[PDB]
């Protein structure tokens, strides 16, 4: 509940902790990972997973 990111591409799952999205999907940042571009956000479904920023855009 803060920053919202939008998926540009349809990147599948790469890590058990990572969560796939569909271009146009919005995700909310919940926490940041050891890496920058790499950020952990949740879905509107209440799902929690990490997503590559290089695959999405942060409106914030």
């Amino acid at each position: 509940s803060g920053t919202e990111c939008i998926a540009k591409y349809n990147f599948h799952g790469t890590a058990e902790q990572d969560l796939p999205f569909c271009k146009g999907d919005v995700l909310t940042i919940v926490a940041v990972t050891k890496d920058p571009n790499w950020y952990k956000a949740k879905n509107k479904v209440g799902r929690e997973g990490i997503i590559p920023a290089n695959y999405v855009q942060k409106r914030e």
Partner: peptide, 18 residues
Amino acid sequence: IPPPLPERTPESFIVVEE
């Protein structure tokens, strides 16, 4: 080949207490 996402570090399991 396009630019692949960032390296998948396991440290992700830890959240920095910014």
